[PDB]
Design a protein around this nucleic acid. Structure first.
Ligand code: 0R5
Ligand code: MG
Ligand code: MG
Ligand code: MG
Length: 539
DNA sequence: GACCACGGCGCC
DNA sequence: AAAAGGCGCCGTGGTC
């Protein structure tokens, strides 16, 4: 390429180098742009940012996030990563995409700029003819990246002093548990070490081993194994409680408070847009899509996520979402009838599980049933079901049989989906998002059958993902106009932040936009709650 | 210090 | 553990 002076022309492709991967924390080391066999390198990267109309290139969102941090409204535009991911969602890294589509991901801004332009040309040409993938790029993914940038740069408030106080309390409980565990073992050991614990449990206490680990074939000490051993020795229960507290303390209570950004006073995750096989987003550094909620200590941690003073959080969550999608994809009359009648599959399974009438099902009962409902849908074995519910094997077998016989077309849809996946080599969502599954043709049954479960799940989980993404795209401009904020997406859930005076109107609006995102053969319902913290905002 | 495979486990 | 699918992070034991 030929060196030309900064600034580049309009529509040029950017390349930039960060001191670290997280845009909210990085120093902008270098910045460059490329167009028309020219490369323009910027003397002063930060000042050079004021010269761009949009971030166009590999990882566009990240530079946009950094620009937003510095008070610059630089929106992300075309990004070759998005094109590659739509062509084949195994395209997840710039290193991989470069190797596959025509260059090398280096550590130099100018080469990265030239690389962005080359890759965009090639990938765009491969997208020609693919009208449905084109529709997803222009109407969903590309504008979505703008929305995600604003979400990352805005972040979410955390009650730091609360978490610190909670730490000290949980530290003391952990000490009680480990001390009791050592007493029962007769000696101390590293309780955090599953190799040491296995020896204690199965060699010293002579407990029966239940299962083996995958790669190394050791005797498993997982929660499920321990659960099976709960009656066998008093140490087991203590170990389960220890596992829960230390998981929560080391993963959330201790690290979160140290991640508060000095400028914003808030927590800033990254919303990774090309990271899953199904079209879901992922969240990292920190992951805020896996904040605890299910156990009492977990709920206490979730409370730490709060609104700015004078504002309220609004949480909206699609009802039974993948079941609704499955009703649309499969066309099962019975399943459609369920939703047109306003019924609840989770609640109904809960009624069976606990042996109570539908009217007498508490939220806890309904929620334990959700894990059962999807486990079965996506292929859980009778054996596992019987062990999870502590019922006889043949009772678990019966539940699974009735489950599919009551929704007769679901199995037909699965069979069609797999058949089509064998011929084409890929499966797709309602909007044409593809996932390649070559192992549908594998000659080893266990491999083929795992491939099959991956394959028929993808259209369902992926269609739900498409709907959520499209809804964020439609919702975002409305919120800006109302002076409200989009903070987090947790798969089928959105968390917003609204001025207290408008929290209610924002809630109503958001609900309507999400339920009407894309009319199906069944209604989409959204549960919405409002509160001063994340826990109270989901009731 | 930084990486890794692994088992394990938090959320959807 | 197990014929659920999809993620990212943690500590240990280990290397470099
Ligand atoms: C307390 C509690 C609690 C919270 C969440 C779950 C869960 C879940 C799962 C969700 N999913 C998919 C299908 C779900 O429809 C989708 C969204 O999860 P989620 O919002 O929790 O459930 P869903 O929408 O079906 O019902 P909802 O309670 O009406 O929201 O993610 C799974 O594939 N497997 C699961 O185990 C289980 C218990
Ligand atoms: Mg839901
Ligand atoms: Mg949800
Ligand atoms: Mg170490």
């Amino acid at each position: 390429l030929e060196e030309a002076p900064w600034p580049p022309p309009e529509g040029a492709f950017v390349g930039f180098v960060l001191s670290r991967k997280e845009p909210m924390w990085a120093d902008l080391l270098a910045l460059a742009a490329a167009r028309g066999g020219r490369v323009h390198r910027a003397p002063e990267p930060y000042k050079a940012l004021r010269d761009l109309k949009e971030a166009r290139g590999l990882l566009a969102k990240d530079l946009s996030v950094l620009a937003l941090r510095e008070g610059l409204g630089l929106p992300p535009g075309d990004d070759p990563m998005l094109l590659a991911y739509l062509l084949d969602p195994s395209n997840t890294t710039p290193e991989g995409v470069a190797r596959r589509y025509g260059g090398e991901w280096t550590e130099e801004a100018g080469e990265r700029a030239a690389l962005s332009e080359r890759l965009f040309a090639n990938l765009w040409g491969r997208l020609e003819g693919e009208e449905r993938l084109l529709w997803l790029y222009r109407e969903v993914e590309r504008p979505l990246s703008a929305v995600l940038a604003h979400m990352e740069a805005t972040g979410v408030r955390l009650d730091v002093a609360y978490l610190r106080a909670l730490s000290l309390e949980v530290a003391e409980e952990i000490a009680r548990l480990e001390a009791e565990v050592f007493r029962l073992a007769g000696h101390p050991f590293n309780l955090n070490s599953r190799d040491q614990l296995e020896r204690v449990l199965f060699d010293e206490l002579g407990l029966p081993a239940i299962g083996k680990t995958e790669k190394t074939g050791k005797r498993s000490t997982s929660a499920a194994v321990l659960e099976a051993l709960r009656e066998a020795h008093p140490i087991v229960e203590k170990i389960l409680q220890y596992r829960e507290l230390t998981k929560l303390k080391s993963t959330y209570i201790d690290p979160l408070p140290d991640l508060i950004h000095p400028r914003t006073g808030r927590l800033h995750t990254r919303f990774n847009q090309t990271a899953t096989a199904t079209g879901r987003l992922s969240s990292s550094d920190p992951n805020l899509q896996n904040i605890p909620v299910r156990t009492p200590l977990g709920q206490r941690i979730r409370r730490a996520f709060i609104a700015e003073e004078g504002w309220l959080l609004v949480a909206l969550d699609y009802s039974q979402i993948e079941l609704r999608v499955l009703a649309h994809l499969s066309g099962d009359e019975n399943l459609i009838r369920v939703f047109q009648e306003g019924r609840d599959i989770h609640t109904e399974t809960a009624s069976w599980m606990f042996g109570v009438p539908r009217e007498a099902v508490d939220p806890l009962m309904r929620r334990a049933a959700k894990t059962i409902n999807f486990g079965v849908l996506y292929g859980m074995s009778a054996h596992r079901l019987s062990q999870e519910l502590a019922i006889p094997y043949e009772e678990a077998q019966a539940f699974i049989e009735r489950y599919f016989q009551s929704f007769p077309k679901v199995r037909a849809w699965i069979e069609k989906t797999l058949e089509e996946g064998r011929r084409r080599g890929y499966v797709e969502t309602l909007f044409g998002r593809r996932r390649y599954v070559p192992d549908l043709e594998a000659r080893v049954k266990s491999v083929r059958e795992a491939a099959e479960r991956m394959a028929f799940n993808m259209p369902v989980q992926g269609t739900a993902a498409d709907l959520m993404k499209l809804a964020m795209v439609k919702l975002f401009p409305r919120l800006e106009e109302m002076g409200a904020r989009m903070l987090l997406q947790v798969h089928d859930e959105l968390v917003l932040e609204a001025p207290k005076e408008r929290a209610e109107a924002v809630a109503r609006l958001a609900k309507e936009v999400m339920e009407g995102v894309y009319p199906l053969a069944v209604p989409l319902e959204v549960e919405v709650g409002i509160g001063e913290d994340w826990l109270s905002a989901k009731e």
